[PDB]
DNA sequence: CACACACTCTCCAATTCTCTAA
DNA sequence: TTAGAGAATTGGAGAGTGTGTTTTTTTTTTTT
């Protein structure tokens, strides 16, 4: 009987606790009006989730003693609260159906302890701690009901798990043969379980100390909700269990291993027609192209055409070998704005990636095969170019990638695939990634006596695959320096209003790009076709002088990509002469910056081969 | 280490700590432990294997660990130069370098670390200067860029095979976390070390693997770098990156670049020789016609100084703009100046505002930053 | 080795067989 | 005719016995 039940050696009455929690559910209307948690139990009826999250601050404000009993004795109290919630969910809404009994999930919003100060006095208390997940194990199947069958006579029985053990039948009731009941593993019933290793956050550490870690266990319906690298305030019971000295011996070490029996996660670092009509109205705004290009990278100064090219890359061409991915190269001295621009723009798009061209990159450009450490089996770890299969890949310090990386990147940029024949695996992974690059000069400074390919020492076989190449060196003008200094002073005086304006611009920019990807598919108009043919023929007519080649058809395909991207920027859905002229302008400016021989200006052969005519005529 | 016999590895003892004796100790700490020396009585298979022998542990019972007049002395307006003089009286000259080192210990407004680098030939008193900063600073480390058989600049994972439980430990950058890390022969670093320092300069944390899995490990230390020429004595006809043989992506990170060049000078050589001979003859520095300030008092001073939080006004921002553009004219006419230069002079001016112990910068701060950068370039030239 | 599987061996007692009274 | 007390046969609980238990040097190919 409920009224006779009392927590063991505790004098807390279970029925009183249940009724007090029901009173909390009934009366708590005031988080700052129906009760908040009865509103949530109205929502759960249609949402269908099997849990009710509740705030321990709310419980404490309603009743100090109930909160204290929850914190002190969660192992008994939380099942009591579950029974209370499942009674209320059929007192109200009595005709409802739900596949599982509701699980209450108490939590304090902030940490009650930090993991360095956990003590044995905290054992079996409800606590919550802040941390970062280091590793997350495979889904462990944990038994909850053992199904036994008689080997002789096929009689079956079911027995509950007591405290992890099984009360094996020892004799079959329907034929009385001893030791004849056999556990049928796949007829038994299992719940989900997973181990999570949690490290304290870096700011919480003492000065120069290595991290402490704690083990978490998350069970059914709360199992796979966290990933490595994320941050969480995790609420659970601080358990202490014995560990056996040897797997074949039941002696246990005197020192108990501890872990967190997880009850609630709260991720702390992860974060419509109105949106559609706002974006549609914004697409008709005058100079929307310049508006979006200026919204790109507010911290960076004056680089208009670079931002415009990055915008056209982020919008991309029309998908349908018909590669629509626009390739962009940034080129300039170390310490300049290109690295900051890459580190900004990679998080501005879904499916994006950022990596270094050097061997210290966390995720390499090439796919490889490794032994997964937690299980020591082979796993095909694909590279960043493959993980960014429909997004931008930001390759910083592009220039100094080794020859194998150069070859596989050439393969990716030309074929939009990455072939691997490593360890018996033979497969051709898709990589429709938009390569955005940042390349330094080989020496410490840019050399105006030399063109881009000779300064950066990259092959023409890679440089000719890029749609646009831009120079990020700064002028030596005192007006430029003074304007840059005023801009940097404004960045120093950046305040909350500028931050909110920049974040509003960032949000609408992300939404605009995603919507344009989702719905816009530009297609050629007749004037677009005539303009593109005219552009290619005109830029080929320059070759009448000196008998040189001044263009090649991949330039035309690049212009098609850029025009389609510009049409997608303004949500036209049909590409026409306005887009084609902007594509021509930006493309010609990129060639003017990149393909300029110092002796004669722009010359197209610099991209086709290294060593332009003014250099090669030494021999 | 200084108590081990001559030809022997240092011995170790397991200490088991219970109750309120726990959490008294930390790694790297010097302690004296009163306890009971006892044998570990293992069970089962280990008993027949070990026989009458037994491992031992120490059952710990006790663990023990081994101003307004002064503020008026600090109030004397000499205090800036008084401190600069107190910094390493064993080294003559380079007084502006000593001022820069003081601002390194102070730090700017919170970024904030004044990373600096001072190149020179071997034996130029460069190592002696770095050793002084390591001794003075409250949290610090001193290491070689090369190749050490110890734990590297990054932390490392030890095994402790009697238990077999792998654990992270050390790392010069990690041990120096809140303070300053001094690196000798920075030029001779491996590429892994160069990338680690690059990561520290970028985001002030490093990545390391324990058992194939990996974590992030925190280190916000200021870097004090000493480097050699690639060959011989420094020649000013060659640029610093080509001479020192370091990439500009790292070498531009340091706020100040100094060249501690050494050349003969008769009277200064004789003064130096008299100093060294007195040090050998009496095991102490000779009297210097002044009293260095107590290092504990210097630590108190820089602590309350670092607790001040300056901010720049708009007029001083305009002054920063004018000084920066003029300095960039000079650099362009003679190129290792960029937006990082403006941020460097802002950092140094806020550092001097902290040194003045006032929550707003002033013209003398920007003047000091400008002249320190200019004369560091002059020392390099 | 001291703590677990696997097998043999011993005597206790649990249930039925048989004789007797109600 | 039906049910309880004394004697006989066999199940198995328990005691005893036997057995089982990272880190350094040297090479080779390929990466620069
Ligand atoms: Zn059976």
UniProtKB/Swiss-Prot annotation, chain A:
Which reaction does this enzyme catalyse, per its entry? ATP + H2O = ADP + phosphate + H(+)
Q: How is it modified after translation?
A: Sumoylated; SUMO2 modified in response to stress caused by inhibition of proteasome activity (in vitro).
Motif segment (Arginine finger) = 464-467
Cellular component terms per the entry's GO annotation: chromosome, telomeric region; CMG complex; MCM complex; membrane; nucleoplasm; nucleus
Q: Name one GO biological process term.
A: mitotic DNA replication initiation
**Disulfide pairs?**
none
Compartment annotation: Nucleus; Chromosome
Q: Which EC number(s) does UniProt give?
A: 3.6.4.12
Arranged from A to Z, the UniProt key words for this protein are: Acetylation, ATP-binding, Cell cycle, Chromosome, DNA replication, DNA-binding, Helicase, Hydrolase, Isopeptide bond, Nucleotide-binding, Nucleus, Phosphoprotein, Ubl conjugation
- What extra comment accompanies this record? Early fractionation of eukaryotic MCM proteins yielded a variety of dimeric, trimeric and tetrameric complexes with unclear biological significance. Specifically a MCM467 subcomplex is shown to have in vitro helicase activity which is inhibited by the MCM2 subunit. The MCM2-7 hexamer is the proposed physiological active complex.
| Family membership noted in the UniProt record | Belongs to the MCM family.
Name of the protein: DNA replication licensing factor MCM4
What is the organism of origin for this protein? Homo sapiens
Name the encoding gene, please: MCM4
Query: Shown portion of the whole protein?
Result: 146 to 797 of 863
From Swiss-Prot, chain B:
Annotated motif Arginine finger, positions: 252-255
Chain intervals for the UniProt region annotation (Interaction with RAD17): 260-303
Q: A biological process (GO) annotation for this entry?
A: double-strand break repair via break-induced replication
Record's keyword annotation contains Flavoprotein: no
Enzyme Commission number(s) from the entry: 3.6.4.12
Q: Which reaction does it catalyse?
A: ATP + H2O = ADP + phosphate + H(+)
Every copy of the MCM domain together lies at 79-277
The molecular function GO annotations come to: ATP binding; ATP hydrolysis activity; DNA helicase activity; single-stranded DNA binding
Residue numbers binding ATP 2: 253, 340
Location relative to the cell: Nucleus; Chromosome
Presence of the UniProt keyword Hydrolase in the record: yes
Q: Where does ATP 1 bind?
A: 92, 123, 125-127, 228
Modification Phosphoserine, positions: 239
Record PTM: O-glycosylated (O-GlcNAcylated), in a cell cycle-dependent manner.
Q: Which UniProt keywords apply?
A: Acetylation, ATP-binding, Cell cycle, Chromosome, DNA replication, DNA-binding, Glycoprotein, Helicase, Hydrolase, Isopeptide bond, Nucleotide-binding, Nucleus, Phosphoprotein, Ubl conjugation
> Per the record, GO CC terms?
chromatin; chromosome, telomeric region; CMG complex; MCM complex; membrane; nucleoplasm; nucleus
- More info: Early fractionation of eukaryotic MCM proteins yielded a variety of dimeric, trimeric and tetrameric complexes with unclear biological significance. Specifically a MCM467 subcomplex is shown to have in vitro helicase activity which is inhibited by the MCM2 subunit. The MCM2-7 hexamer is the proposed physiological active complex.
Which proteins does it associate with, and in what oligomeric form?
Component of the MCM2-7 complex. The complex forms a toroidal hexameric ring with the proposed subunit order MCM2-MCM6-MCM4-MCM7-MCM3-MCM5. Component of the CMG helicase complex, a hexameric ring of related MCM2-7 subunits stabilized by CDC45 and the tetrameric GINS complex. Interacts with the ATR-ATRIP complex and with RAD17. Interacts with TIPIN. Interacts with MCMBP. Interacts with ANKRD17. Component of the replisome complex composed of at least DONSON, MCM2, MCM7, PCNA and TICRR.
What does the similarity note say? Belongs to the MCM family.
What does the protein in this record do? Acts as a component of the MCM2-7 complex (MCM complex) which is the replicative helicase essential for 'once per cell cycle' DNA replication initiation and elongation in eukaryotic cells. Core component of CDC45-MCM-GINS (CMG) helicase, the molecular machine that unwinds template DNA during replication, and around which the replisome is built.
Q: What is this protein called?
A: DNA replication licensing factor MCM7
Species, as recorded: Homo sapiens (Human)
């Amino acid at each position: 009987l409920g009224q006779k039940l009392v927590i063991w050696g505790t004098d807390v009455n279970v029925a009183a606790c249940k009724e007090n929690f029901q009173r909390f559910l009934q009366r708590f209307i005031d988080p700052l009006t129906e009760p908040l948690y009865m509103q949530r139990l109205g929502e759960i009826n249609v949402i269908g989730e099997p849990f009710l999250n509740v705030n321990c601050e709310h419980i404490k404000s309603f009743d100090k003693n109930l909160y204290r009993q929850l914190i002190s004795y969660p192992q008994e109290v939380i099942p009591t609260f579950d029974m209370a919630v499942n009674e209320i969910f059929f007192d109200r809404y009595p005709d409802s159906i739900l596949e599982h009994q509701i699980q209450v999930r108490p939590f304090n919003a902030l940490k009650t302890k930090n993991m360095r100060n956990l003590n044995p006095e905290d054992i079996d208390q409800l606590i919550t701690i802040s941390g970062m997940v280091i590793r997350t194990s495979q889904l462990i199947p944990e038994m909850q009901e053992a199904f036994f069958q008689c080997q002789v006579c096929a009689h079956t029985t079911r027995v509950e798990m007591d405290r992890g053990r099984i009360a094996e039948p020892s004799v079959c009731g329907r034929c009385h043969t001893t030791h004849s009941m056999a556990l049928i593993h796949n007829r038994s019933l299992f719940s989900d379980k997973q181990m999570i290793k949690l490290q304290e956050s870096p700011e919480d550490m003492p000065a120069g100390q290595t991290p402490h870690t704690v083990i978490l266990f998350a069970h059914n319906d709360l199992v796979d909700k966290v990933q490595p690298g994320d941050r969480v305030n995790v609420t659970g019971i601080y358990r202490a269990v014995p560990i056996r000295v040897n797997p074949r011996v039941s002696n246990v070490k005197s020192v108990y291993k501890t872990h967190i029996d997880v009850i609630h996660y709260r991720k702390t670092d992860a974060k419509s027609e109105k949106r559609v009509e706002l974006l549609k109205e914004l697409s008709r705004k005058p100079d929307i192209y310049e508006r979006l290009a200026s919204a790109l990278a507010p911290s960076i100064y004056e680089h208009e055409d670079i931002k415009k090219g990055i915008l056209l890359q982020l919008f991309g061409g029309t998908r349908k070998k018909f590669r629509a991915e626009i390739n962009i190269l940034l080129c300039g001295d170390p310490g300049t704005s290109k690295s900051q621009l890459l580190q900004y723009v990679y998080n501005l798009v879904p499916r994006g990636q950022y990596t270094s061209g050097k061997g210290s990159s966390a995720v390499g450009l090439t796919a490889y095969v490794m032994k997964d450490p937690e299980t020591r089996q082979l796993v095909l770890q694909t590279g960043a170019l493959v993980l960014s299969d429909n997004g931008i890949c930001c390759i910083d310090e592009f220039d100094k990638m080794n020859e194998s990386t150069r070859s596989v990147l050439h393969e990716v940029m030309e074929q939009q695939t990455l072939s691997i024949a490593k360890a018996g695996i033979i497969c051709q992974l898709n990589a429709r990634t938009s390569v955005l690059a940042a390349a330094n000069p080989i020496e410490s400074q840019w050399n105006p006596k030399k063109t881009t390919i000779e300064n950066i020492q990259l092959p023409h076989t890679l440089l000719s695959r890029f749609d646009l190449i831009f120079l990020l060196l700064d002028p030596q003008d005192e007006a430029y320096d003074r304007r840059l200094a005023h801009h940097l002073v404004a960045l120093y005086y950046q305040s909350e209003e500028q931050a909110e304006e920049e974040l509003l611009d960032m949000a609408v920019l992300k939404d605009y790009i995603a919507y344009a990807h989702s719905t816009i598919m530009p297609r050629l108009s007749e004037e677009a076709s005539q303009a593109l043919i005219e552009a290619y023929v005109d830029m080929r007519k320059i070759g009448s002088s000196r008998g040189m080649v001044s263009a090649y058809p991949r330039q035309l395909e690049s212009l098609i990509r850029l025009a389609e991207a510009h049409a997608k920027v303004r949500l036209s859905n049909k590409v026409e002469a306005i887009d084609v002229e902007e594509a021509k302008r930006l493309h010609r400016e990129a060639l003017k910056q990149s393909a300029t021989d110092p002796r004669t200006g722009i010359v197209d052969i610099s991209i086709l081969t290294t060593g332009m005519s003014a250099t090669s005529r030494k021999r | 280490s200084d108590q081990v016999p001559v030809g022997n590895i240092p011995r170790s003892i397991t200490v088991l700590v219970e109750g309120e004796n726990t959490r008294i100790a930390q790694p790297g700490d010097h302690v004296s432990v009163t306890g009971i020396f006892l044998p570990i009585l293992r069970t089962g298979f280990r008993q027949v294997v070990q026989g009458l022998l037994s491992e031992t542990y120490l059952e710990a019972h006790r663990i023990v660990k081994m101003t307004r007049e002064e503020l008026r002395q600090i109030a004397e307006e000499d205090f800036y130069e008084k401190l600069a003089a107190s910094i390493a009286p064993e080294i003559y000259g380079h007084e502006d370098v000593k001022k820069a080192l003081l601002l390194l210990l102070v730090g700017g407004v919170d970024r904030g670390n004044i990373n600096i680098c001072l190149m020179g030939d071997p034996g130029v008193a460069k190592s002696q200067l770095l050793s002084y900063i390591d001794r003075l600073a409250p949290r610090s480390q001193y290491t070689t860029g090369r190749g050490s058989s110890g734990v590297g600049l990054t932390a490392a994972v030890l095994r402790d095979s009697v238990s077999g439980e792998l654990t992270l430990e050390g790392g010069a950058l990690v041990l120096a976390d809140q303070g300053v890390c001094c690196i000798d022969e920075f030029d001779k670093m491996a590429e892994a070390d160069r990338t680690a320092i690059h990561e520290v300069m970028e985001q002030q944390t490093i990545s390391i693997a324990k058992a194939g899995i990996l974590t992030t490990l925190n280190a916000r230390c200021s870097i004090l770098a000493a480097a050699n020429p690639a060959y011989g004595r420094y020649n000013p006809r060659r640029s610093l990156e080509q001479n020192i043989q370091l990439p500009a992506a790292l070498l531009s990170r340091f706020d100040l670049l100094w060249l501690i060049q050494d050349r003969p000078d008769r009277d200064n050589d004789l003064r130096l020789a008299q100093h060294i001979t007195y040090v050998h003859q009496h095991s102490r520095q000779p009297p210097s016609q002044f009293e260095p300030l107590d290092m504990k008092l210097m630590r108190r001073y820089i602590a309350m100084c670092r607790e001040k939080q300056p901010m720049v006004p708009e007029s001083l921002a305009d002054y920063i703009t004018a000084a920066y553009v003029e300095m960039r004219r000079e650099a362009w006419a003679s190129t290792y100046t960029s937006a990082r230069t403006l941020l460097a002079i802002l950092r140094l001016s806020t550092a001097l505002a902290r040194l003045r112990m006032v929550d707003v910068v002033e013209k003398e701060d920007v003047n000091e930053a400008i002249r320190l950068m200019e004369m560091s370039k002059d020392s390099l030239l």
